[PDB]
Amino acid sequence: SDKIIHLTDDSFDTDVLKADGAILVDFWAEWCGPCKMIAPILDEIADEYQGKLTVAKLNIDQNPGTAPKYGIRGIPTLLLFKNGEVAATKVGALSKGQLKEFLDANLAGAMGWCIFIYNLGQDADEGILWQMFGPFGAVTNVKVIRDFNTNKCKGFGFVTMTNYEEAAMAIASLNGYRLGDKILQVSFKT
Amino acid sequence: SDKIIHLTDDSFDTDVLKADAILVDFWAEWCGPCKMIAPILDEIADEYQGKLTVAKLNIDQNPGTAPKYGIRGIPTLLLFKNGEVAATKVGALSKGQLKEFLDANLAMGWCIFIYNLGQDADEGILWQMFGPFGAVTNVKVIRDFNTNKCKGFGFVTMTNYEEAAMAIASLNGYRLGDKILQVSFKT
Ligand code: NA
Ligand code: NA
Ligand code: NA
Ligand code: NA
């Protein structure tokens, strides 16, 4: 598809972070089975969602600098951006129907309970948050806030939990948890 | 409480791995929730005599043990059965809650095998891959006894078949770093 932006590490800020409107970024590379599976699907989506979504690709072999800035551990990974901010993430192979469902749910949009985690160490990552909160119930989204300049955790993140009771159980249990050398604060985001 | 065992790195093998159901509590002096739960342990230790042993491992005194079980914080409880991790519970909890946890783990879901993990793979990687697909109940990274490096494989347990299946269909062939993964239902 001629509608898909060919990203580079240098074009990322302009093409994604300053874009208006939703941008779906595909992290991929030539040595990757599921990349090849989803490539035709992304082409059809770029056509079928034109006017509501822009599709962008970043080859991580040629552009090794971006994926680490978003905690991206492998490929294929889809990141949905809105106004310069990650709204949602989808990892690995998927069907066209499944991609549409992801897009449609995240383009509509606020669902789940939001938890605020403060005083994370500079090495904290999405993995840490998944491992803390996942045992308590279904989590739909995790966001680690990273410093623009460093790529390190800026000291806080968020987790989104489907059911209120599970979220309050995680909060009651994880507040005060000492993760490495940092005692954590864990609360409902007001 | 005299019912507690006092673990050291050097006695871990003997007290935990070579012994036969124990609950290990990783803790330290600078830790709020550790103080909150330490009285609940003593109640459990006398209250579970015969059926379970409680032991403690101070992570300052004994800093070897934690990263060999991928423990990143305290407090963390690990339930071993015959030398392997059966279950884990992180953070503060009521007596009620620890009862629930011990009762149900003495005493499951769909078991997923992940193969070709790199040597630095940990439980966080697995939570992060599988968590988005729905309810995960347990993850286990298999480590080498000698290196404490991931041996190349792990397991995840997921409650709901359709979620497990979607995770398998999506994550098989995912390239995590320089390694392509196999993911399958365990047979
Ligand atoms: Na490539
Ligand atoms: Na939940
Ligand atoms: Na997600
Ligand atoms: Na599940």
Numbering used by the authors:
A (entry chain A): 1 to 109, 111 to 191
B (entry chain B): 1 to 20, 22 to 108, 112 to 191
The authors write:
HuR/ELAVL1 is an RNA-binding protein involved in differentiation and stress response that acts primarily by stabilizing messenger RNA (mRNA) targets. HuR specifically recognizes adenine and uridine-rich elements (ARE) and uridine-rich sequences in 3′ untranslated regions (3′UTRs) of mRNAs. Hu/ELAV proteins share a common protein architecture with two consecutive RRMs, separated from the third RRM (RRM3) by a less conserved, flexible hinge region of variable length. Here, we report crystal structures of HuR RRM3 free and bound to U- and AU-rich RNAs.
To overcome this limitation, we produced RRM3 fused to an N-terminal thioredoxin 1 (Trx) tag via a short uncleavable Gly-Ser-Ala-Met linker to improve solubility and suitability for crystallization. The fusion protein (Trx-RRM3) yielded crystals that diffracted to 2.0 Å. Similar to a subset of RRMs (e.g. PPIE RRM, HuR RRM1) RRM3 has an additional four amino acid β3′ strand between α2 and β4. The β-sheet surface is predominantly positively charged, providing a suitable interface for the binding of RNA. SAXS data recorded for Trx-RRM3 at the lowest tested concentration could be fitted to the crystallographic structure of Trx-RRM3 dimer with χ2 = 1.17. Our crystal structure of RRM3 reveals that the neddylation sites (Lys283, Lys313) are localized and directed away from the main RNA binding and dimerization site.
